[PDB]
């Protein structure tokens, strides 16, 4: 089963990483949309 | 000495020679020995928190029943001065300036143990960068050895303690002690979960 | 800064009303209780909300009626650039430091290029969090943050 | 500890080289191979175990509704204390994972029952979802008619 892991460790890694990154960013924007500034 | 986690194991840099060694450096900042000798000094000076955290906590609980009528630690900006605030900063700065550099040399070369203007008198007699005996220790306590590990450990908790104080203040809008006692209003419902 | 804040703005205020009326024009053909209905109304509250928030946080708004950011460093408007900027550099460095830390660990032994196209080494042993404290790379600078091969 | 005799799931034949019946409960099952690496199996093993141990208890939750034919501060604290507690618990269990012939029987049997709860604990809910009805009575209540 070593094989599947490696398979998931090529440029696909990039897609999974960018999909995870996109999901994070979009969800952040859902909770805090129309953000023109950091006010805290 | 001990280990922060049973597995994973201590690094080689964390020999145990240093007081308060527990093999906790997962990231790896202190890996270069020159790097440690500096971070060892920083941990002591930051740690010694203690002075302050106790300074912001204890007077807050001395004003518990009405023994003293002093403002909160986060309200002591003015007019806690017979000379106004801006006077004090410069005095605090200029002289602290002096003490800090002198302390600085001892980190690179120990050092500046001797007195200065003094016309005909003694000088500090000591060894070790982080801890200088002398009036710094008028009692002449025991530079041991375990305390050195006691010193740390208490300073480390104070640090986390400070981090607690400031955070908690925000949200709990008031005193880290009111805070403390708002929790005691029969907790189990008075948790940070509330906020 | 000839701009007068989004609160006492007549244009930026007018712009809010113009946008929501157009949205309201659209729901008239779908009949409330319907799907395209909320979606339009949900869009309207977001519209009101973002206009409401911008006036709160300051934001000066020009004569055109749109907020203009001030990046001079003015303490009144730090949240418009500096504070987000500090946050960016943090993440920007973190990425930079983690990536650099990786290629360094790879170089000794193995076939180095093998690790570059395939990284069945994840964060190596545990390299990611090392970025939590990247700024301590200042101390890496005083030692060997740079190689001495070419120039100084 | 090798044998071609173990009651395979699918008779004639079922022999994956990784599985051998050395382990307890080895009914020769894994077409996917979801663990052909010893690092792969040694982990799966522990995984397939702890699960079962939990599932059993879950079963012990199906034991209570037939005895009779949820908090002082709902969730929140109840969880953090749980997280904080089972954490340390599971904590050390983690550190241990990476650092008599009679007993084989016990452990072979332990897994199989354990395997049962999971299939069980599972069943009671994907029958409960979409289909608002408890399983409490169903054994002889649904046996009245298909
Ligand atoms: C490179 C220049 C640039 C810059 C500086 C920005 C900046 C911004 N954009 Mg724009 N954008 C750009 C190019 C740029 N964009 C381009 C080329 C396009 C075309 C694809 C877009 C299309 C676009 C859309 C559709 C939107 C934006 C939005 C935004 C704002 C979102 C802030 C936010 O995400 O909340 C906060 C996010 C974080 C704080 C993430 C960091 C936290 C991490 C994940 C964790 C850190 C833990 C410590 C921000 C002002 C949004 C907006 O509403 O504008 C006001 C929005 O709707 N952009
Ligand atoms: C200034 C504070 C400070 C400094 C300079 C040090 C320095 C040191 N520590 Mg110590 N430590 C501290 C605080 C500090 N510590 C606290 C508060 C604790 C309680 C957990 C510990 C627990 C600890 C253990 C168990 C060990 C050490 C050890 C060491 C030595 C090796 C590791 C190192 O280089 O540290 C690097 C210095 C830093 C990383 C300073 C910056 C740290 C970041 C930026 C602060 C994080 C802020 C906070 C998390 C923000 C909120 C986060 C959010 C999620 C809420 C070195 C002398 C090891 C040792 O052998 O001692 C001799 C050892 O094993 N420390
Ligand atoms: C290390 C950090 C630190 C620490 C440890 C302290 C500690 C203290 N501060 Mg301080 N402070 C700090 C930082 C710190 N501060 C900073 C950064 C600021 C901004 C300037 C201040 C500003 C500040 C102000 C304005 C004051 C303090 C005060 C105090 C003291 C409060 C208790 C008291 O009134 O006298 C101690 C209590 C006693 C001595 C009780 C015994 C009194 C004797 C026995 C007389 C007997 C009377 C009678 C017979 C007793 C019977 C009474 C009965 C009826 C109950 C305490 C020593 C108060 C102070 O200066 O204290 C005098 C106060 O005025 N601080
Ligand atoms: C370096 C340690 C330190 C820290 C942590 C603080 C922290 C603070 N100071 Mg202080 N100050 C310091 C050193 C420090 N000071 C020194 C060395 C001086 C010169 C003697 C002063 C002189 C000073 C004045 C005159 C005032 C403060 C005030 C404040 C408060 C600012 C507002 C605030 O926090 O709201 C809340 C924080 C969060 C929500 C987070 C804050 C508690 C202000 C204050 O006391 O508030 C009324 C204020 O007027 N400081
Ligand atoms: C600047 C560095 C420096 C250093 C290393 C010392 C070191 C020392 N001083 Mg000195 N002192 C200093 C600056 C310094 N002093 C300054 C600027 C003043 C005022 C100008 C004094 C006034 C002073 C007095 C009155 C005394 C000391 C004394 C001492 C010794 C007692 C033990 C101790 O201090 O701890 C120790 C040798 C004690 C001593 O033995 O005198 C020589 C003594 O009680 N110091
Ligand atoms: C183009 C050159 C230039 C540069 C390098 C800077 C740099 C800076 N400015 Mg200045 N500024 C400039 C032009 C510049 N400014 C001009 C032309 C104006 C007139 C509109 C200003 C008006 C201005 C104000 C009102 C403030 C700054 C502040 C700052 C500091 C913000 C960062 C900080 O506080 O710590 C992170 C930073 C050093 C702030 C400051 O002084 O720090 C507290 C601040 O209050 N700037
Ligand atoms: C300095 C900071 C620091 C940090 C971040 C940790 C963190 C941890 N410790 Mg450690 N520990 C420390 C200092 C620290 N320790 C020191 C100074 C000592 C004395 C040498 C120990 C002695 C110690 C022992 C004996 C054990 C731990 C264990 C643990 C883990 C328990 C996790 C858990 O379930 O609790 C709560 C979970 C959540 C909140 C989620 C956790 C990773 C336990 C462990 O190893 O677990 C496998 C364990 O048994 N620690
Ligand atoms: C299809 C028919 C069938 C047959 C022949 C068996 C046979 C067996 N089952 Mg099984 N089972 C079945 C259907 C069947 N089951 C079904 C349909 C289910 C789901 C409800 C189960 C659920 C089940 C569980 C949970 C367990 C068994 C166990 C056992 C074994 C216990 C006896 C033993 O090994 O002695 C051991 C031999 C010696 C001690 C030496 C000889 C001594 C004896 C006294 C002579 C035995 C091999 C047990 C097991 O797997 O091993 C413990 C067990 O825990 N079964
Ligand atoms: C909270 C509480 C409290 C109280 O006490 C009571 C109550 C309420 C009840 C509770 C609890 C409960 C619980 C704990 C539960 C649990 C459960 C579980 C664990 C399950 C599993 C479950 C699990 C499961 C199903 C699993 C399954 C699995 C499977 C199928 C697998 C398969 C396979 C394999 C093998 C391999 C090959 O090659 C392939 C495949 C095909 C892939
Ligand atoms: C303040 C401010 C401003 C200004 C700014 C300025 C003007 C500045 C500057 C600046 C400058 C003029 C700087 C410089 C420099 C330099 C150099 C010489 C460099 C370097 C570097 C390095 C070496 C890095 C490295 C690394 C890291 C560390 C991270 C990651 C990456 C690597 C890895 C890449 C304005 C006002 C605009 C805005 C507001 C704020
Ligand atoms: O050795 P401990 O258990 O006192 O650990 C220190 C705490 O994490 C805070 O100092």
UniProtKB/Swiss-Prot annotation, chain B:
GO cellular component terms attached to this protein's record: chloroplast thylakoid membrane; photosystem I; photosystem II
Per UniProt, where does chlorophyll a 5 bind? 150, 168
Cell location: Plastid, Chloroplast thylakoid membrane
Binding residues annotated for chlorophyll b 4, in chain numbering: 103
Q: Which GO terms describe its molecular function?
A: chlorophyll binding; metal ion binding
Q: Which domain of life is it from?
A: Eukaryota
Where is it chiefly localized? plastid
How is the protein altered post-translationally, as described in the entry?
Photoregulated by reversible phosphorylation of its threonine residues.
Q: List the disulfide bonds.
A: none
Domain text: The N-terminus of the protein extends into the stroma where it is involved with adhesion of granal membranes and post-translational modifications; both are believed to mediate the distribution of excitation energy between photosystems I and II.
Name of this chain's protein: Chlorophyll a-b binding protein P4, chloroplastic
User: What species is given as this protein's source?
Assistant: Pisum sativum
Source organism lineage?
Answer: Eukaryota, Viridiplantae, Streptophyta, Embryophyta, Tracheophyta
Location of this fragment in the whole protein: 53 to 248 of 252
């Amino acid at each position: 089963r070593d094989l599947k892991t490696y398979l998931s460790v090529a440029p696909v890694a990039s897609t999974l990483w960018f999909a995870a990154l996109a999901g994070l960013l979009i969800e952040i924007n859902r909770l805090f949309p129309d953000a023109l500034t950091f006010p805290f | 000495k001990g280990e922060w986690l049973p597995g994973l194991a201590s690094p080689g840099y964390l020999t145990g020679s240093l007081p308060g060694d527990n093999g906790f450096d997962p990231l790896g900042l202190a890996e270069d020995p020159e790097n440690l000798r500096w971070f060892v000094q920083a941990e002591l000076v930051n740690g010694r928190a203690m002075l302050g955290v106790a300074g912001m906590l204890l007077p807050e609980v001395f004003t518990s029943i009405g023994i003293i009528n002093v403002p909160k630690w986060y309200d002591a900006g003015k007019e806690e001065y017979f000379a106004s605030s801006s006077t004090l900063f410069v005095i605090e700065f200029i002289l602290f300036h002096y003490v800090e550099i002198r302390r600085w040399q001892d980190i690179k070369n120990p050092g500046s143990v001797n007195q200065d203007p003094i016309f005909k008198q003694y000088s500090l007699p000591a060894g070790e960068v982080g801890y200088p005996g002398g009036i710094f220790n008028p009692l002449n306590f025991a530079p041991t050895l375990e305390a050195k590990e006691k010193e740390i450990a208490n300073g480390r908790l104070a640090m986390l303690a400070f981090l607690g104080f400031i955070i908690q203040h925000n949200v709990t809008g008031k005193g880290p002690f009111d805070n403390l006692l708002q929790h005691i209003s029969d907790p189990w419902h008075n948790t940070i979960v509330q906020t | 800064s000839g701009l007068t804040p989004c609160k006492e703005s007549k244009q930026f205020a007018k712009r809010e009303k113009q946008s929501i009326k157009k949205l309201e024009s659209s729901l008239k053909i779908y009949a409330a209780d319907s799907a395209p209905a909320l979606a339009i109304n949900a869009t309207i509250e977001k519209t009101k909300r973002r206009f409401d928030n911008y006036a709160k946080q300051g934001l000066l708004c020009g004569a055109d009626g749109l907020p203009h950011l001030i990046v001079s460093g003015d303490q009144r408007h730090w949240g418009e650039f500096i504070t987000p900027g500090i946050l960016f550099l943090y993440i920007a460095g973190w990425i930079g430091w983690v990536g650099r830390s990786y290629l360094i660990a790879i170089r000794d032994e193995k076939k180095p290029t093998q690790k570059e196209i395939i990284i069945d080494v994840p964060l190596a042993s545990r390299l990611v969090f090392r970025g939590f404290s990247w700024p301590i790379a200042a101390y890496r600078e005083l030692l060997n943050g740079e190689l001495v091969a070419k120039d100084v | 500890v090798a044998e071609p005799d173990r009651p395979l799931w699918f008779p004639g034949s079922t022999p994956p080289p990784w599985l051998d019946g050395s382990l307890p409960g080895d009914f020769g099952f894994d077409p996917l191979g979801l663990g052909s690496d010893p690092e792969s199996l040694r982990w799966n093993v522990q995984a397939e175990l702890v699960h079962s141990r939990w599932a059993m208890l879950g079963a012990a939750g199906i034991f209570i509704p037939e005895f009779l034919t949820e908090y002082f501060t709902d969730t929140t604290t109840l969880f953090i204390v749980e997280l904080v507690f089972i954490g340390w618990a599971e904590g050390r269990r983690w550190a241990d994972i990476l650092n008599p012939q009679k007993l084989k029987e016990l452990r072979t049997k332990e897994i199989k029952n354990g395997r049962l709860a999971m299939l069980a604990v599972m069943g009671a809910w994907f029958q409960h979802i979409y289909t608002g009805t408890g399983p409490i009575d169903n054994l002889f209540a649904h046996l009245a008619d298909p």
